[PDB]
């Protein structure tokens, strides 16, 4: 396929700080991956992000009913949709599954699977005390299905090893034990 | 604390569009523009919420209008192809005879056109496979997931085959027990 490609994106972004106590709405226009013009609710009118967006910003800023409508969007759009989705997004809790197994390169893998939300602390312990400098991880992995996972690996010569998991779904830490 | 993004694109000359809602990087729903129906990322979301899927066509029609304008304004500057990072991992730790899911993660690419095939022992498999639509990234590139439910065996190897205009050859990511 010889033909050249041309792509327009638009992202209508609602940013929430302390639930709906503080909201910022951003109406962002893209040509390929280059933002050319944006509306920001903290500014209350359009601004050109590049040369290519100057005509659209002038044009749109001259239509006062258009700007009037966009400035109500923190209430009619952002706060409305937070309120629609809260109970199954903001309040979604899915518990982690924790396994420990040895791997080749010798590694103790602490696998933490199927949890929501994303915020998690995984710590390695060897006979009592905490190891940081021999630990390597996957980072947080989004599975694309409203579920994360992470693999936290201890580079070690296998004593009693304990993997500690802290997640919002758990009243207290989950601590899994592995004996050599 | 949280971001909700209504993200849309339109692409010429393919005339491919997409309309979708994202919460903190997860898809809430997209509109199937053909059928005019709301496709919920999880079944359960559709018990709590509705959408006017009919109206998504109006939004895409504005994006096409804007594209035609920006195409001329840019002097017909075409998109630069960016080939994907591809990674293959399981839902959970693999145990023999314990059903599991292979995830193919296709990340950081444009334009949003991609051929993905699951290969079992080098042959295409479709039983049970599902995929997401193109998902937006903070850098305005795309990411995408394909899923293959499978029964783990010592006798099968798997590959995710990914075709994109940014790549010389198709890209194969290997997995095996």
């Amino acid at each position: 396929d010889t033909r050249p490609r041309f792509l327009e994106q638009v992202k209508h972004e609602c940013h929430f700080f302390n639930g709906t106590e503080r909201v910022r709405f951003l109406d962002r226009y893209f040509y390929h991956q280059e933002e050319y013009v944006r509306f920001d609710s903290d500014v209350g009118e359009y601004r050109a992000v590049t040369e290519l967006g100057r005509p659209d910003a002038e044009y749109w800023n001259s239509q006062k009913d258009l700007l009037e409508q966009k400035r109500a969007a923190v209430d009619t759009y952002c706060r409305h949709n937070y309120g629609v989705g809260e109970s199954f997004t903001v309040q979604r809790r899915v518990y982690p599954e924790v396994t420990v197994y040895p791997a080749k390169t010798n590694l103790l893998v602490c696998s933490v699977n199927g949890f929501y939300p994303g915020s998690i602390e995984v710590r390695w312990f060897r006979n009592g005390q905490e190891e940081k400098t021999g630990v390597v991880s996957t980072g947080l992995i989004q599975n694309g299905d409203w579920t994360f996972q992470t693999l936290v690996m201890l580079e070690t010569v296998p004593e009693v090893y304990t993997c500690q998991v802290e997640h919002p779904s758990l009243t207290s830490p989950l601590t899994v034990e592995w004996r050599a | 604390e949280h971001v909700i993004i209504q993200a849309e694109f339109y692409l010429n000359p393919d005339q491919s569009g997409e309309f979708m809602f994202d919460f903190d990087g997860d898809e809430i729903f997209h509109v199937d523009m053909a059928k005019k129906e709301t496709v919920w990322r999880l079944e359960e979301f559709g018990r709590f919420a509705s959408f006017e899927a009919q109206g998504a066509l109006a939004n895409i029609a504005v994006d096409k209008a804007n594209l035609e304008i920006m195409t001329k304004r840019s002097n017909y500057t075409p998109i630069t192809n960016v080939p994907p990072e591809v990674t293959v991992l399981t839902n959970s730790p693999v145990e023999l005879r314990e059903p599991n899911v292979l995830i193919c993660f296709i990340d950081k690419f444009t334009p949003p056109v991609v051929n993905v095939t699951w290969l079992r022992n080098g042959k295409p498999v479709t039983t049970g496979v599902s995929e997401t639509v193109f998902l937006p990234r903070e850098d305005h590139l795309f990411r995408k997931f394909h899923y293959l439910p499978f029964l783990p065996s010592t006798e099968d190897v798997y590959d995710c085959r990914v075709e994109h205009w940014g790549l010389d050859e198709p890209l194969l990511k290997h997995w095996e027990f």
């Binding site: 638009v10 209508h12 109406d27 226009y29 005509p55 659209d56 044009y59 749109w60 258009l66 969007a73 009619t76 759009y77 409305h80 949709n81 309120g83 629609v84 989705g85 | 209504q6 849309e8 309309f19 809602f21 809430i28 729903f29 018990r47 709590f48 919420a49 509705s50 959408f51 006017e52 109206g55 998504a56 109006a58 939004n59 504005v62 994006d63 209008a65 804007n66 304008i69 920006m70 001329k72």
Partner: peptide, 14 residues
């Protein structure tokens, strides 16, 4: 129960 609301892009000038 409750509907999600979309906003529409503004159309630019030629």
């Amino acid at each position: 129960r409750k509907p999600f609301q979309s906003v529409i892009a503004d159309t630019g000038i030629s």
